[PDB]
Amino acid sequence: XXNXXYX
Amino acid sequence: XXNXXYX
Numbered sequence A, B: 001x002x003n004x005x006y007x
């Protein structure tokens, strides 16, 4: 991962 | 709020 979210 | 990130 590395970005975040939440989708 | 309620969503996420990160910016």
Ligand SMILES: *[C@@H]1O[C@H](CO)[C@@H](O)[C@H](O)[C@H]1O[C@@H]1O[C@@H](C)[C@H](O)[C@@H](O)[C@H]1O
Residues within 6 Å of the ligand: A005
């Ligand atoms: C990120 O979000 C997931 C759920 O989707 C959760 O299981 C992780 O523990 C969470 O990561 C933590 O919080 C983020 C802000 C930090 O960058 C990460 O190192 C971790 O402590």
Ligand SMILES: *[C@@H]1O[C@H](CO)[C@@H](O)[C@H](O)[C@H]1O[C@@H]1O[C@@H](C)[C@H](O)[C@@H](O)[C@H]1O
Residues within 6 Å of the ligand: none
């Ligand atoms: C962000 O949300 C995930 C999923 O609930 C959780 O695992 C992380 O602990 C949470 O990160 C915290 O809250 C955000 C808003 C802050 O930017 C981050 O540093 C951390 O405190």
Ligand SMILES: *[C@H]1C[C@](C)(N)[C@@H](O)[C@H](C)O1
Residues within 6 Å of the ligand: A005, A006, A007, B002, B003, B004
């Ligand atoms: C993260 C938060 C959110 C965008 N409100 C939710 O719909 C998702 C499943 O998780």
Ligand SMILES: *[C@H]1C[C@](C)(N)[C@@H](O)[C@H](C)O1
Residues within 6 Å of the ligand: A002, A003, A004, B005, B006, B007
């Ligand atoms: C959340 C994760 C990220 C997109 N890699 C970072 O650049 C931001 C400051 O925090």
